[PDB]
Structure 1
Amino acid sequence: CSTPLGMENGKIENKQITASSFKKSWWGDYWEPFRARLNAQGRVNAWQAKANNNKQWLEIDLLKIKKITAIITQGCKSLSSEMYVKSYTIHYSEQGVEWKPYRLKSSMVDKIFEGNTNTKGHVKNFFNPPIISRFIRVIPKTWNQSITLRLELFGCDIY
């Protein structure tokens, strides 16, 4: 139960990824949410929030309930800009309407995950207990320059 869920290989389609917002690029197009795919190359190769505040989020709808065991976040360098999410929290939901924050057994507080320190390195965090649900949201808490992401999810089908 540790196989990538499809962010970088395309199994997870563009329609399954949404966000609170997303910036317009110098090229006119957008740093769309579905571009936040691991190791993506190109002019606009990541998700970039339109506004840098602690009220943003990237949502991945897996379509069915799955078992998620890990996540990898990556940053993004565009022109002279070096951006990456330094830390974040995770929220999940079975229906997509009510959200539950991820926290460790006996946490009265939200679990803050350690993110990136550069724009290319991969930082992998494991979930224990694992998250079993359909929708997952990455909530950036701190970042460098701008909130930019590229990620991958790991887990497996349930039964």
Structure 2
Amino acid sequence: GSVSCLANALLNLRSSTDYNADHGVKNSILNFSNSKDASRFDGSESWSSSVLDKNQFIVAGSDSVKHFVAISTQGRGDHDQWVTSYKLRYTLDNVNWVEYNNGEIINANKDRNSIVTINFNPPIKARSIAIHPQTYNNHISLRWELYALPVKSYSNPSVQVGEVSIGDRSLNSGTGSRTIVRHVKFPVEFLSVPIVSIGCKKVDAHTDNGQMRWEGKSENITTKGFDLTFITWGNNAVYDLTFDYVAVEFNN
């Protein structure tokens, strides 16, 4: 129940340097492995830097605010190279970068294939995150994965808004439960059925010997629109009512 970001192709990767394109970040996913044919080179089972110093990195980014819950690193699958320690940096606004845990040096790998996982408690909240290898065996070469919370069903909703009124004297006389429907068409048709929230912004109504009774309900909601049912009861004479509505479409 966390998301493997690289496995799902959710993040753009950018390395500092690449030994060459056959050692690029595209070869860096956790457990990456390619042909065992020893007669041809189809790429390192790792990202491998070109320059060996303490300034190399891979930046992983996208526009969404991610809640990173863990990172896993691994050495290189096909040669004895691995990152033995690293630092992490991240940014929420893509302008100001901070060091994870005050520049903590994280102890990492000691062989080609064993996975080392660090859990973030609390999650790192970031748009971009960078692994900054500090020490290495033989070469700065690694495979990795970044784990994030799944997107919530309530995130990134679509919204259309409008207003609706009775607009005449339909409810301005009579006795007992009395209702009128105003059909509202959304400016644009939704892809799926939204919810429709409403709030009153005008009352022009007579009490029934002091009792005020008015109600609005959004009903018969479709992708194209909905009905605002205006309601009164007892003997109230309602002259006009106005609602603003906010139609919200989730998960689409």
Residues 82 and 142, structure 2, Cα contact 8 Å, conserved in 1: yes
Residues 17 and 58, structure 1, Cα contact 8 Å, conserved in 2: yes
Shift of 1:10: 3.6
Residues 15 and 56, structure 2, Cα contact 8 Å, conserved in 1: yes
Shift of 1:4: 3.0
Aligned to 2:17: 21
Shift of 1:101: 0.3
Alignment partner of 2:129 out of 125, 130, 136: 136
Q: Give the structure with higher Rg (CA).
A: 2
How many angstroms apart in 1 are the aligned matches of 2:45 and 2:63? 24
Aligned to 2:71: 71
Shift of 1:40: 0.6
Question: Aligned partner of 1:127: which letter?
Answer: F
* Residues 44-83 of structure 1: CA deviation (Å, up to 9, x unaligned): 22211111100111010033111001110011143xx301
How many angstroms apart in 2 are the aligned matches of 1:150 and 1:63? 23
When structure 1 is superposed on structure 2, of 93-102 and 138-147 the one drifting more is 93-102
**Stretches of structure 2 lacking an aligned partner (at least 5 in a row):** 35-42, 156-252
- Relative to the length of structure 1, the TM-score reads 0.82
Question: Aligned partner of 1:88: which letter?
Answer: Y
Name the count of aligned residue pairs. 144
- Relative to the length of structure 2, the TM-score reads 0.53
- Give 1:75-154 correspondences, 5 Å limit: 75-78=75-78, 81-103=79-101, 109-154=102-147
Aligned to 2:3: 4
Residues 18 and 34, structure 1, Cα contact 8 Å, conserved in 2: no
Matched residue SS, 1:82: coil
What is the Cα-based RMSD across aligned positions, in Å? Answer: 1.7
Shift of 1:152: 0.8
Taking only the aligned residue pairs, the percentage that are identical comes to 25
How many angstroms apart in 2 are the aligned matches of 1:115 and 1:21? 20
Residues 84 and 143, structure 1, Cα contact 8 Å, conserved in 2: yes
Shift of 1:11: 2.5
Shift of 1:30: 2.5
Matched residue SS, 2:26: helix
Which structure has more relative contact order (CA 8 Å, sep 6+)? It is: 1
Shift of 1:22: 0.6
How many angstroms apart in 1 are the aligned matches of 2:89 and 2:10? 19
Residues 82 and 119, structure 1, Cα contact 8 Å, conserved in 2: yes
